[PDB]
């Protein structure tokens, strides 16, 4: 069985939920995890003892003053006059949501220093992070998505002037998770606040149509060798297992697979879909879902181990 | 009076060209360049004496046994008797072509470490490094490109089957730059050679129609504040330089005028450039490479770190650089 390393924290709007994921993965992985590496907002790495990996320790994480590590080839590094002490780290699991983990910075940085990992690489991160780019990627793959307007602080007034709006619609930043800046607009006075709130998260905002009580379906999965290993379908807002045709389930899996291509190799991704007049629409790609969507897999621990092992790793 | 570091080398097929780029900019910029940072194929950072910046020294570089520095917040980590000593870097000029400068990796490292730089950020790097991604980006912007077929290894044996246009073809890696692995294919005898030779440089190959008698024009430039600062138009294959017409003339012409393209065409080249460099290349000096087919402007590619930062295409490059440096937040 593979030894692991869990990376979490990050300079991110999803910092706090990253710690939840890593704490969740502790219950799943237990002893399989050699190291717990915390990445704080100032971009310092710290080693956390397995006994300290709980909510109480992290609320008071400042006072603690841990000794900052510096990333280097094959692992982590501590300095003194005597030289550099190198902690050689095993296959790391990127559990940093948003910010550094999903925008491509960490994929680049881990890849730079030849540290093997589970998570989206640079291209996969960039395209899944920016929703506008996700739309172009999907479009090219013949996978449907909701029509949209991409706005920025510049064209803001120009594009919305002389306009008689067709309500409702949904306003969201071009690149963020957990719905941090996402508001529904039903009337024109509701618009300013929706746009201002979404611009607090991103230079660019996406306006899409709103259709309430539409079917939402989430599928997690990864590629191991030449086959795919899927999770159960989630019905995220309902209320466990989701009720679906064999044929719908199969449409979702087909879409997932086109999306994943070779881009998302080495990652456990969840694609979120809409079903409108029973057509499948791609909502988004979460290449680092909360707790790696472990609770949606029949045998997550074995799926992980199977993926880890199929990696062409080589330090 | 801004100072720069020049970062060059890298794990790139264009490693040698990057060294040439840094020697050229030494020549141009001089001792504004406070530091010269070498990155080798094994990803160690070395500091190099300005006096050692030349072909002869780099021809033997692998034996000079230099002391590797480690990148960290605000610069490079050196050790002393007092422990970690930080060498703070002035604005770095990313001159690592191709692998590691143009693929998003060094952009992420410098951003991660709060190290100010001139060059493409992460999205710009990614979107301009992968020629298939550039094709998708150009399309959404309304910019013309040649049609193509994208090939994998698990799929390359089906090449002719998937082709939706005729011979002749031009075959090229998805991401290699510097005319590396590029072959013109006239007939499917030559196709197996062109393919296995470009798959030497990438997991993906792009196939395009080869079209004869196409005008090639390259345009370099950057955004400074709310204005573009353009270079001369390069014609890579004659090696002549054509510049733009001014409607706001402040001199009387006393000689036979100089060799320019039409007002319409100069305008299109600039328009394609601006919409391409949108907000995604802010902080970079890029060269877009265009084809003109029957009067139309098509994009061949975006090069966010051109060779020698395309400095010989600018009127005053030091002033252009400096003003870009100044405008950065």
Automatic annotation (TrEMBL), chain A:
Obligatory cofactor(s): Mg(2+); Mn(2+)
GO cellular component assignments: cytoplasm
Protein location: Cytoplasm
Broad enzyme group: ligase
Family, similarity comment: Belongs to the D-alanine--D-alanine ligase family.
Originating gene: ddl
Example of a GO biological process term: cell wall organization
GO molecular function, one term: metal ion binding
Keywords noted in UniProt: ATP-binding, Cell shape, Cell wall biogenesis/degradation, Cytoplasm, Ligase, Magnesium, Manganese, Metal-binding, Nucleotide-binding, Peptidoglycan synthesis
The organism's taxonomic lineage, starting at the top: Bacteria, Pseudomonadati, Campylobacterota, Epsilonproteobacteria, Campylobacterales
Pfam families assigned: Dala_Dala_lig_C, Dala_Dala_lig_N
Function: Cell wall formation.
Pathway: Cell wall biogenesis; peptidoglycan biosynthesis
Protein name: D-alanine--D-alanine ligase
E.C. code: 6.3.2.4
Known catalytic reactions: 2 D-alanine + ATP = D-alanyl-D-alanine + ADP + phosphate + H(+)
